[PDB]
Design a protein around this ligand. Structure first.
Ligand SMILES: [Cl-]
Ligand SMILES: [Cl-]
Ligand SMILES: [Cl-]
Ligand SMILES: [Cl-]
Ligand SMILES: [Mg+2]
Lengths: 178, 178
């Protein structure tokens, strides 16, 4: 019933060649989302993995936009609140900001300054761990509020692309390796 | 019992002057999301309003990105899957498209062509009914599939801005009127 759930989740993630550009494999979550059980099982497998490692966050954060999807799903299952981590110009009130390099060049992520109390133990959720650059940025953002990162969890991890190594010092979990 | 829940939701939505540009009052759901019970109560109060109306959807659709957030929480509560309705170029496989007007120009939205089955009755979920443009675009996208629209539900509605009228012939629910 733990292994069976993973194989279920795997089976709803379609591999799509050559998106968004030629020479890259894309992992399409949409059949997982559309299945009445897909987000529930995903969120429950994540909660099971956090329980197994003794990670007890007080609040969840997710990046725009698939991080919103898995983050809200898991936050409901854990009974925690959710904080969106956003692209510049979307948050209305005072922000912190972190600039980071990635594939297409560079960009920024933002949170509200009051997203987190000094007391919070923040779980980052995202769909996919690759180079770990967005996750690092997200970590740097959180720490500007004096909250601490309780850990990071991903639906998927791409083998040996360096992400876990960049996030060394933070607890990192992924349900599926590709 | 249930007007307590509406009061709690209202109490967590910030009103923010001159955002994104002077003249307009931005409604900010981030304290609602942060609160451990925000999303739970928002989704339960959407479920309650649907059930008052005898509306029983088979799948939930929501627009990027705040539609993802309320859409996913509601879909979890109702035991249904979820379909993201996305900005152009995000979805990896064949899409349908609908160009919609806004203030200064047009934009568009997309869904996978295989998102809904012929048997589906889609609930559209979003944060805010203002003019109805994105809601109506979304209704047109769903109706390019074989599926039908069961209804639309919003957290908030800007009174007499014309959204309901544009959504003539579709059932529309909103928790809070501004
Ligand atoms: Cl997606
Ligand atoms: Cl995304
Ligand atoms: Cl937001
Ligand atoms: Cl948004
Ligand atoms: Mg600002």
């Amino acid at each position: 019933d733990d292994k069976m759930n993973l194989d279920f989740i795997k089976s709803k993630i379609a591999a799509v060649p050559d998106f968004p550009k030629p020479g890259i494999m894309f992992r399409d979550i949409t059949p997982l989302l559309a299945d009445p059980q897909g987000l529930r099982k995903t969120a429950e497998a994540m909660a099971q993995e956090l329980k197994n490692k003794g990670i007890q966050p007080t609040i969840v954060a997710g990046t725009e936009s698939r991080g919103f999807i898995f983050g809200v799903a898991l936050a409901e299952v854990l009974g925690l609140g959710f904080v969106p981590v956003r692209k510049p110009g979307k948050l209305p009130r005072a922000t912190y900001s972190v600039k980071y390099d990635l594939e297409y060049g560079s960009d920024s992520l933002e949170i509200h300054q009051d997203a987190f109390k000094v007391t919070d133990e923040v779980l980052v959720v995202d769909d996919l761990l690759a180079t770990g650059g967005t996750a690092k940025a997200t970590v740097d953002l959180i720490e500007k509020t004096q909250a601490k990162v309780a850990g990071l969890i991903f639906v998927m991890e791409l083998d040996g692309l360096g992400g876990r190594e960049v996030l060394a010092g933070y607890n990192v979990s992924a349900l599926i390796k590709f």
